[PDB]
Design a protein around this ligand. Structure first.
Ligand SMILES: Cc1ccc(NC(=O)c2ccc(CN3CCN(C)CC3)cc2)cc1Nc1nccc(-c2cccnc2)n1
Ligand SMILES: Cc1ccc(NC(=O)c2ccc(CN3CCN(C)CC3)cc2)cc1Nc1nccc(-c2cccnc2)n1
Length: 271
């Protein structure tokens, strides 16, 4: 009746493309076809992922829009709307003023990003992932470069979908990838836990490139023999213990994200 009369068509994520004044590409290519825009009615800066008229990735783009409508969490980047009627298609999210977590860690002032802030940042990411685990989703590409930073040290998990340097190779980011995913192409919430461990090492080292002093072609063999990255300088033993638990060889022995989020909470009680 009235609903159908007033909403004849589309869902209440759908927006008119002309609601957004597109400004300039974000990140010089590093996020793909992602632009900063202004959602005019709200004078609100937004990030807009687009897909032009001629590509092979329509289905994946539409599935991404579909997936994002089903998830909502304070530490997952917020969908604001979509344009899916005709190309070029849009997915519009909030804009995160401090950009991606890897670059933030590398470029930040460490008087401000003290130990407590690193813990807060790690805890928030583990909360996003607990929610994904609980809702039966897998991330598949968890890493500092896929997280975003907002005002007040708010961190959110994102997925820029950018398989296509030597981060991704024939396309997997080997250094973040669980053994079972490298050897068998098996991905699960447990392989996300592995990646979270590497992410935590990134946090602990303020954005160092993982496996320093190690050739990429040798990584799987080393992990299999039992090598794991060393405890970073200044890394609390409890944080390293959790890292090492995320890197257990067998996926079943790795903690859940619920357990991981519980561990970070316990570290705020203890110290
Ligand atoms: C989760 C994490 C991971 C790594 C680190 N690392 C550091 O805190 C750290 C310490 C020293 C250095 C070395 N640095 C080299 C250069 N000179 C100038 C300064 C020292 C680097 C990182 C902190 C944390 N944070 C953390 N972990 C557990 C507990 C807490 C915590 C903090 C405050 C209150 N309650 C709990 N905070
Ligand atoms: C504009 C946009 C469009 C889509 C997305 N999508 C996601 O971030 C995302 C997150 C989680 C999922 C969940 N999904 C579950 C299934 N597995 C297989 C994949 C993950 C999907 C998409 C983000 C953005 N946001 C985005 N993208 C790139 C850069 C920025 C950005 C950059 C700098 C400052 N502020 C924002 N912002």
């Amino acid at each position: 009746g009235t609903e159908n009369l007033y909403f004849q068509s589309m869902d209440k994520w759908e927006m008119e493309r002309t609601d957004i004044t597109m400004k300039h590409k974000l990140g010089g290519g590093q996020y793909g076809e992602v632009y900063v825009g202004v959602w005019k009615k709200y004078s609100l800066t937004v990030a807009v992922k687009t897909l032009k008229e001629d590509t092979m990735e329509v289905e994946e783009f539409l599935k991404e829009a579909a997936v994002m409508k089903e998830i909502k969490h304070p530490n997952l980047v917020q969908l604001l709307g979509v344009c899916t009627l005709e190309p070029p298609f849009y997915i519009v999210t909030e804009y995160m003023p401090y950009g991606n977590l890897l670059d933030y860690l590398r470029e930040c002032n460490r008087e401000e990003v003290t130990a407590v802030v690193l813990l807060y940042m790690a805890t928030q990411i583990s909360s996003a992932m607990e929610y994904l685990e609980k809702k039966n989703f897998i991330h598949r590409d968890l890493a500092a470069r896929n997280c975003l930073v907002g005002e007040n040290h708010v961190v959110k998990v994102a997925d820029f979908g950018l398989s296509r340097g030597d981060t991704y190779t024939a396309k997997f980011p080997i250094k973040w990838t669980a053994p079972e995913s490298l050897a068998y192409n098996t991905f699960s919430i447990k392989s996300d836990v592995w990646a979270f461990g590497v992410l935590l090492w990134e946090i602990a080292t303020y954005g160092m490139s993982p496996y320093p002093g190690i050739d990429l072609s040798q990584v799987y063999d080393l992990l299999e023999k039992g090598y794991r990255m060393e405890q970073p300088e200044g890394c609390p033993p409890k944080v390293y213990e959790l890292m090492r638990a995320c890197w257990k060889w067998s996926p079943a022995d790795r903690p859940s994200f619920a357990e991981t989020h519980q561990a970070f909470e316990t570290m705020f009680h203890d110290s």
